[PDB]
Amino acid sequence: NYNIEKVLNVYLRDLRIESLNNNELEILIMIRECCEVIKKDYKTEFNEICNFILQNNVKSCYDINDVKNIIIETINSDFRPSVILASISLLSIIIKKKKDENNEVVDDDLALNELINKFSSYQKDIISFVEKNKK
């Protein structure tokens, strides 16, 4: 009936929104709205995370390979629907900060792809979390 992985690929990998069916589009709207609040409420804390990884990257760039291992480890040790959305929101911030501030190029398709595969196992919980916060 629906596939979360494309919805995350639309939200994170700038995949054309037209690849989504009605459900996957509704799911996208809920994820977009939920993550924007997380990005706004915790803008300060994410930046501290993002600003930390920046100084520890050899090329002074935001690279998802750096944060890749951290997120997957965080999820297994902590499997709450909230910890997943914080990862998506952090990752979404890195993507634009990558786009807006990197003076060099970075290859992280594989890194990000592995991350989205992890989020899709927990899709059942994500839909539950984003749906509740729709109210």
């Binding site: 909230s82 910890v83 959305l85």
Partner: peptide
């Protein structure tokens, strides 16, 4: 694992703050 645990905790705390807010 040193650097990893500090950043995971910052992330885990963001989840705790989220559950408290929305419950």
């Amino acid at each position: 694992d040193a650097s990893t645990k500090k950043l995971s905790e910052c992330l885990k705390r963001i989840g705790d703050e989220l559950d408290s807010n929305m419950e």
